[PDB]
């Protein structure tokens, strides 16, 4: 309000990511998540300072994209319509992903009323993607098959 | 936006249900929850395709109602103002229930701007009810009394 | 809608608090949380009955403030920009805190359309504060250092 809603959602997302992090059992995913938590403070500042302070960089976005590609290689084909769940590790990541998608919606809504750097929405979008991959990888490493609709 | 918000909330709800499912210890509740997760994909399609694709059926609604009646028989009298919590199993179901109630609110809001089949809101309403019953049953089976306000 | 959104958020918050309560390992925090869950029913009635029924008292607000001061003494200096997480106990409290902050936003929005007692927003604000302190105390007692951005 106008960006207070976005800021609040970033905060909520960060808390959900912290929860997923505590449950994660792998260093690569844990490192991704901790990096993201720090990136979210930058995203918040970018949005709040109208881009006058620290800003979301293309490098930050590229890291998420690179990790997504790497994990897609580990998973292989991804059948559409994955039922979210399986393990608590994956479940927590799917909940975090849902909040990240809500963040995307809030950014889009706020952008129509206030100026927001394009990298903010782009980062949020890539974050939703990496969290989905984290969820799939977690189940795979725990020997839990995905259920499809 | 107009239904993007509803779709996003369905997604969030599905993730919370998946979490509650992983924590559940009984086949009847687990089966209800998995059925619901699949029903939510149908609900999403109904809303997105304006009812042109798959739609929420009265049969789907009736199943939830039948299960609610069955569980009400197991619980007996339900004193109003149950403090949500007790066990992690029940706590997760109460969180899922809160999101389902949010889904109801989002459907009502969207229905004033776009056409949405009546079965969509009805299903969402019954879902909020069954999740409440799941929470009560879970505590009962775990020997945890409910706390009342 | 106008206060239906506030009521729904209070419900969601109560469910998140119940989750954090189940995970808590200390009587002081557990007692605070249970008191809050009961206070939330009062907050809901205050909002719904337009202040005609039970209302949020200054005493209820004072209790939260007193507990916050007490816990600040246990923590000592609080470096700004705490990354939410560390333990599942703290993570759940940070998630609850995010929902409480959302409640604050919803109350502010609703107050511009309907009359709401000032104690309602004040209580919500203090609740967000105490949950943050609960999260810090939980990690401290579990020998988990906070991570700072």
Short mmCIF file of C-alpha atoms in Angstrom, two decimals:
data_model
loop_
_atom_site.label_atom_id
_atom_site.label_comp_id
_atom_site.label_asym_id
_atom_site.label_seq_id
_atom_site.Cartn_x
_atom_site.Cartn_y
_atom_site.Cartn_z
CA UNK A 1 0.00 0.00 0.00
CA UNK A 2 1.22 0.94 -2.45
CA UNK A 3 4.26 -1.29 -1.90
CA UNK A 4 3.53 -2.09 1.74
CA UNK A 5 1.65 -5.17 0.54
CA UNK A 6 4.64 -6.24 -1.55
CA UNK A 7 6.99 -5.67 1.38
CA UNK A 8 4.75 -7.70 3.66
CA UNK A 9 4.57 -10.55 1.17
CA UNK A 10 8.36 -10.56 0.79
CA UNK A 11 8.55 -10.88 4.57
CA UNK A 12 6.07 -13.76 4.62
CA UNK A 13 7.92 -15.50 1.80
CA UNK A 14 11.23 -15.12 3.61
CA UNK A 15 9.70 -16.80 6.68
CA UNK A 16 8.38 -19.71 4.61
CA UNK A 17 11.78 -20.12 2.95
CA UNK A 18 13.43 -20.19 6.38
CA UNK A 19 11.08 -22.99 7.35
CA UNK A 20 11.86 -24.97 4.19
CA UNK A 21 15.56 -24.39 4.85
CA UNK A 22 15.46 -25.91 8.34
CA UNK A 23 13.83 -29.01 6.87
CA UNK A 24 16.20 -29.37 3.90
CA UNK A 25 18.86 -32.09 4.04
CA UNK A 26 21.17 -31.07 1.18
CA UNK A 27 23.84 -28.37 1.01
CA UNK A 28 23.05 -27.31 -2.54
CA UNK A 29 19.39 -26.63 -1.77
CA UNK A 30 20.23 -25.12 1.63
CA UNK A 31 22.76 -22.77 0.02
CA UNK A 32 20.23 -21.75 -2.64
CA UNK A 33 17.63 -21.02 0.02
CA UNK A 34 19.95 -19.00 2.24
CA UNK A 35 21.12 -16.98 -0.76
CA UNK A 36 17.48 -16.32 -1.62
CA UNK A 37 16.70 -15.15 1.91
CA UNK A 38 19.46 -12.58 1.58
CA UNK A 39 18.31 -11.65 -1.93
CA UNK A 40 14.83 -10.97 -0.55
CA UNK A 41 16.18 -8.19 1.66
CA UNK A 42 17.66 -6.64 -1.49
CA UNK A 43 14.37 -7.10 -3.33
CA UNK A 44 12.57 -5.36 -0.48
CA UNK A 45 14.98 -2.42 -0.54
CA UNK A 46 14.71 -2.14 -4.32
CA UNK A 47 10.92 -1.93 -4.04
CA UNK A 48 10.88 0.39 -1.00
CA UNK A 49 13.53 2.86 -2.16
CA UNK A 50 12.03 2.95 -5.64
CA UNK A 51 15.35 1.60 -6.86
CA UNK A 52 17.38 4.36 -5.22
CA UNK A 53 19.09 2.02 -2.78
CA UNK A 54 20.35 -1.52 -3.38
CA UNK A 55 18.76 -3.14 -6.41
CA UNK A 56 18.09 -6.63 -7.73
CA UNK A 57 20.83 -7.45 -10.22
CA UNK A 58 20.73 -9.53 -13.38
CA UNK A 59 23.47 -11.61 -11.76
CA UNK A 60 21.08 -12.53 -8.92
CA UNK A 61 18.47 -13.58 -11.48
CA UNK A 62 21.04 -15.52 -13.51
CA UNK A 63 22.06 -17.56 -10.48
CA UNK A 64 18.51 -18.80 -9.97
CA UNK A 65 18.15 -19.60 -13.66
CA UNK A 66 21.44 -21.53 -13.69
CA UNK A 67 20.38 -23.58 -10.68
CA UNK A 68 17.00 -24.31 -12.25
CA UNK A 69 18.70 -25.63 -15.40
CA UNK A 70 21.07 -27.74 -13.31
CA UNK A 71 18.22 -29.31 -11.33
CA UNK A 72 16.13 -29.90 -14.46
CA UNK A 73 19.02 -32.06 -15.65
CA UNK A 74 18.86 -34.12 -12.45
CA UNK A 75 15.09 -34.57 -12.64
CA UNK A 76 14.76 -35.22 -16.35
CA UNK A 77 11.29 -34.99 -17.86
CA UNK A 78 8.73 -33.13 -15.76
CA UNK A 79 5.15 -34.32 -16.23
CA UNK A 80 2.75 -31.41 -15.82
CA UNK A 81 0.31 -31.31 -12.91
CA UNK A 82 2.45 -32.46 -9.99
CA UNK A 83 0.35 -32.95 -6.84
CA UNK A 84 2.23 -30.94 -4.18
CA UNK A 85 3.47 -33.07 -1.30
CA UNK A 86 5.24 -36.37 -0.70
CA UNK A 87 7.75 -35.42 1.98
CA UNK A 88 7.74 -32.64 4.55
CA UNK A 89 10.80 -31.26 2.77
CA UNK A 90 8.95 -31.03 -0.54
CA UNK A 91 5.69 -29.91 1.06
CA UNK A 92 7.38 -26.93 2.73
CA UNK A 93 8.99 -25.92 -0.55
CA UNK A 94 5.65 -26.09 -2.36
CA UNK A 95 4.10 -23.86 0.32
CA UNK A 96 7.00 -21.42 -0.12
CA UNK A 97 6.48 -21.58 -3.89
CA UNK A 98 2.80 -20.67 -3.51
CA UNK A 99 3.75 -17.61 -1.48
CA UNK A 100 6.35 -16.65 -4.09
CA UNK A 101 3.65 -16.80 -6.76
CA UNK A 102 1.48 -14.60 -4.54
CA UNK A 103 4.45 -12.20 -4.36
CA UNK A 104 4.49 -12.11 -8.17
CA UNK A 105 0.81 -11.19 -8.21
CA UNK A 106 1.33 -8.45 -5.63
CA UNK A 107 4.26 -7.01 -7.59
CA UNK A 108 2.19 -6.91 -10.77
CA UNK A 109 -0.65 -5.15 -8.94
CA UNK A 110 1.66 -2.61 -7.31
CA UNK A 111 3.55 -1.91 -10.54
CA UNK A 112 0.39 -0.41 -12.03
CA UNK A 113 0.34 2.22 -9.28
CA UNK A 114 4.04 2.75 -8.56
CA UNK A 115 7.36 2.40 -10.38
CA UNK A 116 9.12 -0.90 -9.73
CA UNK A 117 12.31 -2.13 -11.40
CA UNK A 118 11.66 -4.91 -13.91
CA UNK A 119 14.26 -7.14 -12.24
CA UNK A 120 12.02 -7.38 -9.18
CA UNK A 121 9.23 -9.28 -10.93
CA UNK A 122 11.72 -11.27 -12.98
CA UNK A 123 13.54 -12.39 -9.84
CA UNK A 124 10.25 -13.32 -8.15
CA UNK A 125 9.27 -15.36 -11.19
CA UNK A 126 12.54 -17.27 -11.24
CA UNK A 127 12.25 -17.84 -7.49
CA UNK A 128 8.89 -19.55 -7.95
CA UNK A 129 10.58 -21.80 -10.50
CA UNK A 130 13.59 -22.76 -8.39
CA UNK A 131 11.41 -23.59 -5.39
CA UNK A 132 9.41 -25.98 -7.57
CA UNK A 133 12.64 -27.65 -8.65
CA UNK A 134 13.82 -27.83 -5.02
CA UNK A 135 10.61 -29.67 -4.16
CA UNK A 136 11.08 -32.21 -6.95
CA UNK A 137 14.75 -32.77 -6.14
CA UNK A 138 13.98 -33.26 -2.45
CA UNK A 139 11.48 -36.04 -3.14
CA UNK A 140 13.79 -37.66 -5.68
CA UNK A 141 16.65 -37.80 -3.19
CA UNK A 142 14.30 -39.23 -0.56
CA UNK A 143 13.06 -42.00 -2.88
CA UNK A 144 9.55 -40.54 -3.05
CA UNK A 145 7.85 -40.63 -6.47
CA UNK A 146 5.78 -37.66 -7.56
CA UNK A 147 2.03 -38.07 -7.89
CA UNK A 148 0.49 -36.59 -11.04
CA UNK A 149 -3.03 -35.33 -11.69
CA UNK B 1 -7.15 -11.12 -11.60
CA UNK B 2 -9.89 -11.64 -12.38
CA UNK B 3 -9.53 -15.33 -11.52
CA UNK B 4 -5.74 -15.34 -11.27
CA UNK B 5 -6.12 -14.63 -7.56
CA UNK B 6 -8.50 -17.58 -7.19
CA UNK B 7 -6.13 -19.83 -9.14
CA UNK B 8 -3.22 -18.76 -6.97
CA UNK B 9 -5.18 -19.41 -3.79
CA UNK B 10 -6.20 -22.87 -5.02
CA UNK B 11 -2.50 -23.55 -5.57
CA UNK B 12 -1.59 -22.35 -2.08
CA UNK B 13 -4.39 -24.41 -0.56
CA UNK B 14 -3.25 -27.51 -2.44
CA UNK B 15 0.26 -27.05 -1.00
CA UNK B 16 -1.09 -26.71 2.55
CA UNK B 17 -3.22 -29.83 2.08
CA UNK B 18 -0.16 -31.72 0.86
CA UNK B 19 1.62 -30.71 4.05
CA UNK B 20 -1.29 -31.85 6.23
CA UNK B 21 -1.37 -35.11 4.27
CA UNK B 22 2.28 -35.94 4.98
CA UNK B 23 1.60 -35.46 8.69
CA UNK B 24 -1.64 -37.47 8.79
CA UNK B 25 -1.55 -40.95 10.33
CA UNK B 26 -4.88 -42.41 9.16
CA UNK B 27 -5.91 -43.83 5.80
CA UNK B 28 -9.39 -42.35 5.83
CA UNK B 29 -8.13 -38.79 6.33
CA UNK B 30 -5.19 -39.35 3.97
CA UNK B 31 -7.54 -40.63 1.26
CA UNK B 32 -9.86 -37.65 1.75
CA UNK B 33 -6.93 -35.25 1.45
CA UNK B 34 -5.48 -36.85 -1.66
CA UNK B 35 -8.91 -36.87 -3.30
CA UNK B 36 -9.22 -33.18 -2.46
CA UNK B 37 -5.83 -32.39 -3.98
CA UNK B 38 -7.01 -33.93 -7.22
CA UNK B 39 -10.38 -32.16 -6.95
CA UNK B 40 -8.55 -28.85 -6.64
CA UNK B 41 -7.05 -29.27 -10.10
CA UNK B 42 -10.61 -29.73 -11.39
CA UNK B 43 -11.77 -26.68 -9.45
CA UNK B 44 -8.95 -24.67 -10.99
CA UNK B 45 -9.86 -25.77 -14.51
CA UNK B 46 -13.54 -25.03 -13.90
CA UNK B 47 -12.65 -21.49 -12.83
CA UNK B 48 -10.04 -20.89 -15.55
CA UNK B 49 -12.00 -22.29 -18.50
CA UNK B 50 -15.14 -20.52 -17.35
CA UNK B 51 -16.69 -23.95 -17.02
CA UNK B 52 -15.87 -24.96 -20.59
CA UNK B 53 -13.43 -27.67 -19.55
CA UNK B 54 -13.68 -30.09 -16.63
CA UNK B 55 -16.12 -28.92 -13.97
CA UNK B 56 -16.75 -29.48 -10.28
CA UNK B 57 -19.52 -32.06 -9.98
CA UNK B 58 -22.26 -32.42 -7.40
CA UNK B 59 -20.84 -35.89 -6.78
CA UNK B 60 -17.52 -34.33 -5.68
CA UNK B 61 -19.41 -32.05 -3.29
CA UNK B 62 -21.52 -34.94 -2.00
CA UNK B 63 -18.44 -36.96 -1.11
CA UNK B 64 -17.15 -34.20 1.15
CA UNK B 65 -20.56 -33.79 2.77
CA UNK B 66 -20.86 -37.54 3.39
CA UNK B 67 -17.43 -37.65 5.02
CA UNK B 68 -18.27 -34.65 7.19
CA UNK B 69 -21.42 -36.38 8.44
CA UNK B 70 -19.47 -39.57 9.12
CA UNK B 71 -16.82 -37.75 11.15
CA UNK B 72 -19.42 -35.72 13.05
CA UNK B 73 -20.74 -39.07 14.27
CA UNK B 74 -17.28 -40.02 15.55
CA UNK B 75 -16.75 -36.70 17.32
CA UNK B 76 -20.21 -36.26 18.79
CA UNK B 77 -21.13 -32.81 20.10
CA UNK B 78 -18.93 -29.98 18.86
CA UNK B 79 -18.59 -27.08 21.30
CA UNK B 80 -18.22 -23.82 19.40
CA UNK B 81 -14.99 -21.83 19.56
CA UNK B 82 -12.34 -24.53 19.27
CA UNK B 83 -8.85 -23.11 19.80
CA UNK B 84 -6.88 -24.36 16.76
CA UNK B 85 -3.96 -26.60 17.69
CA UNK B 86 -3.18 -29.53 19.97
CA UNK B 87 -1.14 -31.76 17.67
CA UNK B 88 0.93 -30.97 14.61
CA UNK B 89 -1.53 -33.09 12.64
CA UNK B 90 -4.47 -30.96 13.75
CA UNK B 91 -2.52 -27.70 13.54
CA UNK B 92 -1.64 -28.31 9.88
CA UNK B 93 -5.27 -29.07 9.07
CA UNK B 94 -6.43 -25.87 10.77
CA UNK B 95 -3.90 -23.89 8.72
CA UNK B 96 -5.20 -25.60 5.56
CA UNK B 97 -8.75 -24.79 6.66
CA UNK B 98 -7.89 -21.10 7.04
CA UNK B 99 -6.54 -21.03 3.50
CA UNK B 100 -9.67 -22.80 2.24
CA UNK B 101 -11.80 -20.09 3.87
CA UNK B 102 -9.60 -17.50 2.16
CA UNK B 103 -10.29 -19.35 -1.10
CA UNK B 104 -14.02 -18.97 -0.43
CA UNK B 105 -13.57 -15.22 0.03
CA UNK B 106 -11.57 -14.94 -3.19
CA UNK B 107 -14.20 -16.89 -5.12
CA UNK B 108 -16.96 -14.62 -3.84
CA UNK B 109 -14.96 -11.53 -4.83
CA UNK B 110 -14.15 -12.88 -8.30
CA UNK B 111 -17.72 -14.03 -8.93
CA UNK B 112 -18.86 -10.39 -8.90
CA UNK B 113 -16.58 -9.65 -11.85
CA UNK B 114 -16.59 -12.93 -13.77
CA UNK B 115 -18.88 -15.93 -14.24
CA UNK B 116 -18.04 -18.86 -11.97
CA UNK B 117 -20.02 -22.09 -11.62
CA UNK B 118 -21.93 -22.28 -8.34
CA UNK B 119 -20.41 -25.68 -7.55
CA UNK B 120 -17.01 -24.03 -7.17
CA UNK B 121 -17.95 -21.99 -4.11
CA UNK B 122 -20.07 -24.82 -2.73
CA UNK B 123 -17.14 -27.23 -2.99
CA UNK B 124 -14.81 -24.72 -1.34
CA UNK B 125 -17.28 -24.28 1.49
CA UNK B 126 -17.59 -28.01 2.11
CA UNK B 127 -13.81 -28.33 1.96
CA UNK B 128 -13.42 -25.83 4.80
CA UNK B 129 -15.85 -27.97 6.78
CA UNK B 130 -14.17 -31.32 6.17
CA UNK B 131 -10.74 -29.93 7.08
CA UNK B 132 -12.16 -28.76 10.42
CA UNK B 133 -13.51 -32.26 11.03
CA UNK B 134 -10.16 -33.78 10.04
CA UNK B 135 -8.48 -31.61 12.67
CA UNK B 136 -10.90 -32.71 15.40
CA UNK B 137 -10.64 -36.38 14.47
CA UNK B 138 -6.85 -36.23 14.42
CA UNK B 139 -6.67 -34.90 17.99
CA UNK B 140 -9.29 -37.38 19.18
CA UNK B 141 -7.33 -40.32 17.79
CA UNK B 142 -4.15 -38.96 19.38
CA UNK B 143 -5.77 -38.62 22.83
CA UNK B 144 -5.57 -34.82 22.75
CA UNK B 145 -8.59 -32.94 24.13
CA UNK B 146 -9.75 -29.80 22.36
CA UNK B 147 -9.37 -26.46 24.11
CA UNK B 148 -12.40 -24.17 23.95
CA UNK B 149 -12.62 -20.39 24.16
CA UNK C 1 -15.52 -7.52 3.44
CA UNK C 2 -15.74 -5.11 5.04
CA UNK C 3 -14.39 -6.91 8.11
CA UNK C 4 -14.80 -10.44 6.74
CA UNK C 5 -11.23 -10.20 5.47
CA UNK C 6 -10.02 -9.15 8.92
CA UNK C 7 -11.97 -11.98 10.55
CA UNK C 8 -10.52 -14.48 8.11
CA UNK C 9 -6.99 -13.24 8.74
CA UNK C 10 -7.49 -13.48 12.51
CA UNK C 11 -8.56 -17.09 11.95
CA UNK C 12 -5.50 -17.83 9.82
CA UNK C 13 -3.23 -16.19 12.37
CA UNK C 14 -4.77 -18.21 15.19
CA UNK C 15 -4.04 -21.41 13.25
CA UNK C 16 -0.41 -20.41 12.68
CA UNK C 17 -0.03 -19.57 16.38
CA UNK C 18 -1.45 -22.97 17.28
CA UNK C 19 1.20 -24.56 15.09
CA UNK C 20 3.99 -22.53 16.70
CA UNK C 21 2.59 -23.48 20.11
CA UNK C 22 2.79 -27.22 19.45
CA UNK C 23 6.44 -26.79 18.48
CA UNK C 24 7.40 -24.58 21.44
CA UNK C 25 9.41 -26.13 24.27
CA UNK C 26 9.07 -23.48 27.01
CA UNK C 27 6.19 -22.73 29.36
CA UNK C 28 6.59 -18.96 29.21
CA UNK C 29 6.32 -18.85 25.42
CA UNK C 30 3.60 -21.52 25.38
CA UNK C 31 1.56 -19.55 27.93
CA UNK C 32 1.98 -16.35 25.92
CA UNK C 33 0.82 -18.11 22.76
CA UNK C 34 -2.21 -19.74 24.35
CA UNK C 35 -3.22 -16.41 25.91
CA UNK C 36 -2.91 -14.82 22.47
CA UNK C 37 -5.08 -17.49 20.87
CA UNK C 38 -7.81 -16.65 23.36
CA UNK C 39 -7.24 -12.92 22.86
CA UNK C 40 -7.75 -13.39 19.12
CA UNK C 41 -11.32 -14.57 19.69
CA UNK C 42 -11.89 -11.34 21.62
CA UNK C 43 -10.27 -9.33 18.84
CA UNK C 44 -12.56 -11.01 16.33
CA UNK C 45 -15.66 -10.22 18.38
CA UNK C 46 -14.55 -6.61 18.87
CA UNK C 47 -14.20 -6.21 15.10
CA UNK C 48 -17.38 -8.12 14.20
CA UNK C 49 -19.71 -6.54 16.76
CA UNK C 50 -18.32 -3.09 16.01
CA UNK C 51 -17.21 -2.98 19.62
CA UNK C 52 -20.68 -3.76 20.99
CA UNK C 53 -19.66 -7.13 22.39
CA UNK C 54 -16.42 -8.10 24.10
CA UNK C 55 -13.58 -5.69 23.34
CA UNK C 56 -9.80 -5.70 23.31
CA UNK C 57 -8.65 -4.15 26.58
CA UNK C 58 -5.60 -2.02 27.34
CA UNK C 59 -4.72 -4.70 29.89
CA UNK C 60 -4.46 -7.29 27.08
CA UNK C 61 -2.15 -4.94 25.17
CA UNK C 62 -0.09 -4.20 28.28
CA UNK C 63 0.56 -7.89 28.87
CA UNK C 64 2.12 -8.28 25.43
CA UNK C 65 4.21 -5.15 25.92
CA UNK C 66 5.44 -6.35 29.33
CA UNK C 67 6.45 -9.72 27.89
CA UNK C 68 8.26 -8.04 25.00
CA UNK C 69 10.28 -5.91 27.43
CA UNK C 70 11.08 -8.97 29.53
CA UNK C 71 12.33 -10.94 26.51
CA UNK C 72 14.32 -7.98 25.18
CA UNK C 73 16.24 -8.14 28.46
CA UNK C 74 17.04 -11.82 27.86
CA UNK C 75 18.17 -11.24 24.27
CA UNK C 76 20.12 -8.04 24.78
CA UNK C 77 21.03 -6.04 21.68
CA UNK C 78 19.01 -6.87 18.57
CA UNK C 79 20.89 -6.35 15.31
CA UNK C 80 18.48 -5.27 12.59
CA UNK C 81 17.78 -7.51 9.60
CA UNK C 82 17.45 -10.94 11.21
CA UNK C 83 17.16 -13.68 8.57
CA UNK C 84 14.06 -15.65 9.65
CA UNK C 85 14.80 -19.28 10.49
CA UNK C 86 17.33 -21.33 12.43
CA UNK C 87 15.09 -23.81 14.23
CA UNK C 88 11.64 -25.10 13.40
CA UNK C 89 10.47 -23.43 16.61
CA UNK C 90 11.72 -20.04 15.46
CA UNK C 91 10.69 -20.58 11.84
CA UNK C 92 7.07 -21.25 12.84
CA UNK C 93 7.01 -18.11 14.97
CA UNK C 94 8.38 -16.01 12.10
CA UNK C 95 5.65 -17.39 9.83
CA UNK C 96 3.06 -16.51 12.48
CA UNK C 97 4.61 -13.05 12.76
CA UNK C 98 4.27 -12.49 9.01
CA UNK C 99 0.58 -13.35 9.20
CA UNK C 100 0.16 -11.00 12.17
CA UNK C 101 1.70 -8.19 10.10
CA UNK C 102 -0.74 -9.07 7.32
CA UNK C 103 -3.52 -8.79 9.92
CA UNK C 104 -2.28 -5.28 10.73
CA UNK C 105 -2.48 -4.34 7.06
CA UNK C 106 -6.00 -5.75 6.76
CA UNK C 107 -7.14 -3.86 9.86
CA UNK C 108 -5.76 -0.60 8.49
CA UNK C 109 -7.54 -1.18 5.17
CA UNK C 110 -10.85 -2.07 6.82
CA UNK C 111 -10.68 0.86 9.25
CA UNK C 112 -11.00 3.27 6.32
CA UNK C 113 -14.38 1.75 5.45
CA UNK C 114 -15.75 0.72 8.84
CA UNK C 115 -15.36 1.75 12.49
CA UNK C 116 -12.85 -0.36 14.41
CA UNK C 117 -11.67 0.22 17.97
CA UNK C 118 -8.12 1.58 18.15
CA UNK C 119 -7.10 -1.19 20.56
CA UNK C 120 -7.56 -3.73 17.78
CA UNK C 121 -4.73 -2.42 15.62
CA UNK C 122 -2.60 -1.67 18.67
CA UNK C 123 -2.98 -5.24 19.91
CA UNK C 124 -2.15 -6.62 16.46
CA UNK C 125 0.96 -4.47 16.34
CA UNK C 126 2.18 -5.64 19.73
CA UNK C 127 1.44 -9.24 18.73
CA UNK C 128 3.75 -8.95 15.73
CA UNK C 129 6.42 -7.71 18.14
CA UNK C 130 6.06 -10.46 20.73
CA UNK C 131 6.15 -13.19 18.08
CA UNK C 132 9.45 -11.79 16.82
CA UNK C 133 10.81 -11.91 20.36
CA UNK C 134 9.51 -15.48 20.78
CA UNK C 135 11.45 -16.47 17.67
CA UNK C 136 14.69 -14.94 18.97
CA UNK C 137 14.30 -16.46 22.43
CA UNK C 138 13.59 -19.89 20.97
CA UNK C 139 16.82 -19.93 18.96
CA UNK C 140 18.81 -18.56 21.90
CA UNK C 141 17.57 -21.33 24.19
CA UNK C 142 18.37 -23.91 21.51
CA UNK C 143 21.95 -22.64 21.06
CA UNK C 144 21.26 -21.40 17.53
CA UNK C 145 22.83 -18.05 16.59
CA UNK C 146 20.82 -15.62 14.48
CA UNK C 147 21.96 -14.90 10.94
CA UNK C 148 21.97 -11.23 9.94
CA UNK C 149 21.63 -9.63 6.51
#
